[PDB]
């Protein structure tokens, strides 16, 4: 797996792979 710099859509491109489309919340802050 690659250690990489990622903002928004790129960060979700790791998130979506790491969570394997099972599910996640990419929101930067809760409130």
């Amino acid at each position: 797996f690659v250690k990489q710099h990622l903002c928004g859509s790129h960060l979700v491109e790791a998130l979506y792979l790491v969570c394997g489309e099972r599910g996640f919340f990419y929101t930067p802050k809760t409130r």
Binding site: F1, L11, A14, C19, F24, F25
Partner: peptide, 22 residues
């Protein structure tokens, strides 16, 4: 937020698997 770490520095499953809800 994790974005503040991942967009400025470097991330992998070791950081991102904290976002998953499932």
């Amino acid at each position: 937020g994790i974005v503040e770490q991942c967009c400025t520095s470097i991330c992998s499953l070791y950081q991102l698997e904290n976002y998953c809800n499932s």
